[PDB]
Subunit: 246 residues, 6 copies
């Protein structure tokens, strides 16, 4: 395993936010890309423009051979993303893009991850929660619902009883509650959120990118039927090209 | 995000009896929209016989069709048993399972004491389960010459995961309220004396939310399990919603106005 | 195999229609129940009352131990069911009821099977079509859709390309076209329609009702996820009750399964 | 009330939108058909990564053009629709997903060869109109490749498992009549009438409810694509919900800092 | 490709030592042939027969010189009339055919009935003689196959035809089978093996790894996680054949820093 | 319920290892077969031979009508199995565990790692000692199990935990495994076999037929048509044991038309 010294080393961030109004986008030299929703004034809720930019940034990250892991997070300590405002439903494109991204996407959550913003963290492969993080859906209370990955995939995370509770009542849940039901991967003190997140990112960066790619697709394949097969078979095709028989 | 005040949530509940004709169950309705179906055979720990199931089906259909009802509670009479299983002394409980599954309103298992065997599958079928601290859970099939290999198995695995589902079925042990909570088999555990109080609160929290959103989400979550049957529910709600829009009304309007439908006038979205 | 003489024997229908406004309900002595949409003045389109009645009639046939097969059909020779005319969308209840009926259900189709009425014939296990039969959807032409079994299950019948064509264009298809894409099981001259349908019913009636029941559930199981497992496993449970091992557990004192073999 | 032969077969006024594209042509008709044409007849319309990038760009434009209701995918000339692959090496997988999730009917108009990667492309299209000189088949196992995604599973949902295994394992070529008989294409027409017939089919769809077509396409995908299909279908449901008074009461209440009153709305059976 | 190659004579070698109920042969060009040899009972299988077929198929799977397997019946009157009623390991045989990483071809002359019909369906391809007869018998003789015999049949012929075949238990001739997509082709009885060998050789000309991956992928549309196990297993195998995958065993701390992180 | 005294009675293991080199194989009188990987020197990693022998032993247990439950374990107290020895016949063994009609219990002491971790997951139940360690290693050593090692892992611990396990390849102690539902129970190392045997005896007291139908039904939630083959296969077996099923057999045997008209048509 990597040593705590390298895992907890300072990070060399370079800004790549040119042209974005709603988000910051940064890359570290050791292979991490970070997308930060930058609207703390509205608790980092997204509007169609925000989504358009996030899609832009993620495509760039996917296409950058130096980038191995992506972080999705919100500006400040009070919110990851408090929901959608509140082309229209372009966040559905973003969900699919996170899903099919052949690199791990890690949600770094401080404060509220709510509504459309809660589905976004669920869509990420992993979630690192600050001890101040708050989670929940709001659909039925505000005249919406996410019945796609927001529902079924939530069930594959926390189980059907809990998923029905989360959606039907629309309560809020603190970090411990989220951890207890398997909704997040770990809870760390707010001060160490990014520190610990970078560590998790670095642990993955030390591993085979091809293996990670294949495993993400295999795990998607337990959910996404033929769409999941397209991903998994796609990687097999890519591997076949790299061999002699190929 | 304004939530309901606790004063409202914990206000007294008024049940009105609608049990006329039932022998094995009680059926009651609150004026604020909860329907409560109670297995009423406390002397046999609320075990169900075919008659009990017929009556619960009848009551659940009523609750479904009553536009004043938004949520249903399923429970057992007394403090000792939600339902101890099938009366051992035909298999129409399979129909009741489907009926709970496809009910467009949330169904809540309110569990005191034993939820066992067929009665355990019943609480699992309900969307949520509120358990009293004296609640006991488990299957009995392999110990009594039976099994539920339908939703009793697969769906249980979607609740507690595959390792725990195999343990529950293979050994047929009993589990206390803390055990069930820990594995995610129930949603919360509350003091026995507060069982109905907290259950009603949960119901009222749902009653404040969109009925349409709730039926859509219920269908969507069933859709993760029930293949094309799930698609039928989810798509049927989509159809219902479509009928509530101008485009979804043009066909009926055209027919009424004796003209061909015209979809040229509607905007295409991305 | 059964003798053609017996298969094509005359059939004597007994009326059980008492109390129905929109349908006829009849039973044969040899175990066929026939449900007939009786609204020729509207090409046998169904309204919510029609559906409630068909649900009632099908529930009766399910519980009648004398009935082994159900026929669904439309009155007259011009329409099986032309479409929709408890509650507004109760046809969804009826679809599920046909699906989970442990007895084979056969659509007997003369003339139009269209829209909601086309999904109905698809739901039936088999379809015997008259040479004048006409099939198709109408949803997108009249601002509606059936995205449930009306879409996915159709695709399991005719394949994805054909399913998309049927729904997206909403054309009508003759009996030959329907047969060519596997949408119906056979096409017979209009005069022979009930004759050939009764033969098919009698062929199934000669077979094991338990085997048919299990196979219907098994075939549904390829489509309906856990709902399908509920049906298939439920039949397994019923079978288990009929065995000595099942009955021992139920008689047991601590049960004693030791006297039972742990087969491979 | 049906189309009308005169309208269906009327002339089509195409407008060029190919500015900037190297490998494809892109055109739109005034009545709502967008046509993406692979423009590489010199190599039997095989695609290279740039070709795929451009098709992605064009398809996204059509998706977002509220004037467009149907998309035609085709190859330049009469000899090939697409003969396979040679911006990254496997970006055709992106294009596959984009056709899949496009809320508008996509029609493959096939003249001549639809082979290999190009065969999977026509399969992904909702419908396929084939000219009588059309030839279909896979080549992977012969050329050190395979499409085990929708190229396999989805093919089986079209032609059945026996035929799908045959097509892939032997890599033969099939003529239009063979393809028609196995359910692989929707119709076969004379080469000279290919666009004429295709446009008719497009026009027949253009007469229908765009929302209904959208929901049905997602419903049909949903029989194949698991949760990804649920995402499409449920997404359409959410979109419709926003258009209802009940949905709107939820939004209004939240924006006015008040509890919503959904009680004014029935709890249907 | 090349008619003279495809229809060239076939050189068979016997490998039947020890078998009572079957013959097992291997050609010099990489085809294995398992022949049910009980023509006096229309090639119905008894438990012994299934045991031997499992043995033979396991051998064929593990023989690197074999690229395609033919399953057939002795004589011209019967592929397999089903389970010997005079007497359930056939479920093991089904799984083995399913998970065989090489194409399995059913060469059908005469009856393929009941259990014997499920067998041809399980094979990847079916070449039928014009004298072939297909159908199920379960509901007529107190049985059913509700596993691959039901669901997978539906993935071949569609749900209407599947329900008809099972519910009525009629027999279907070669043209009927072809018309519903139940078999891949129908040929004159005298040319059955000739054409079957051609199809086999056409497959033998293609990549065995690609065929293996495609079979798993097509199974994966049906077999849930069991299908994923097959498909992902092939991907794991392919991975081992790459530099990145080798960086493990070549080390035996591994260093993946060098490898691109592709889109 | 079974008596505590009976459940905790001493075990009488009878050896059946004859002809094996990498494993021990033993049967108890009361119906438990135990397969032990016997390569303590290499933390009980498997080589192709080990797998071939485990396949042989598992097949024997399946066919032995005296056996109702199988235990899979590793020699000593330091490792259950640390994975592949540094083929893919282990894939056949996974399927063999999956389709075994008898419950299979992983009795885990110390390391269950890599290929050895998938093996415990494949078992119906896992009894873990307080010294057990779990984790995958694929991405760290240039491999992956994208089959049941992935999808089925998600059906146990949920999708978030499954991705964490695979992507980082950390090690997890027994408490962590329990909390995530990866194992069924954790017991003091000293009582590992005592407790494992109790769980086995608890199962042995139950209907073998009900157990195999339920194992198939639970597999069926994961394995599509392959799972339908298992579940339906059991239904057919049950059917054969009924008068109705048997009539069809007799009728065909006695060269006469079957008469099913004498059997009830249930709702």
């Amino acid at each position: 395993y990597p040593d705590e010294a390298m895992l907890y080393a300072p990070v060399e961030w370079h800004d790549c936010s040119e042209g974005f109004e709603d988000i910051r986008y940064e890359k570290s030299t050791d292979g991490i890309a970070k997308i930060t929703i930058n609207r703390p004034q509205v608790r980092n809720a997204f509007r169609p423009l925000t989504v358009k930019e996030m899609i832009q940034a993620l495509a760039d990250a996917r296409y950058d051979d130096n980038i191995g892991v992506i972080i999705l997070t919100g500006a400040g300590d009070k919110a990851f993303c408090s929901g959608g405002d509140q082309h229209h439903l372009n966040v559905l494109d973003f969900q699919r893009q996170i899903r099919t991204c052949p690199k791990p996407v890690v949600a770094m959550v401080a404060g509220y991850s709510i509504g459309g913003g809660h589905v976004l963290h669920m869509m990420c492969d992993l979630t690192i929660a600050a001890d101040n993080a708050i989670f929940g859906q709001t659909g039925p209370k505000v005249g919406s619902f996410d019945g796609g990955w927001g529902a079924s995939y939530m069930a594959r995370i926390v189980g059907q009883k809990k998923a029905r509770e989360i959606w039907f009542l629309c309560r809020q849940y603190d970090a411990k509650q989220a951890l207890d039901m398997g909704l997040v991967n770990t809870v760390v003190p707010l001060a160490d959120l990014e520190k610990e997140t970078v560590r998790w990112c670095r642990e993955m960066l030390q591993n085979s990118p091809m293996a990670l790619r294949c495993l993400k697709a295999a795990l998607n394949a337990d959910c996404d039927g033929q769409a999941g097969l397209q991903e998994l078979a796609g990687n097999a095709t890519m591997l076949f090209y790299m061999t002699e028989e190929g």
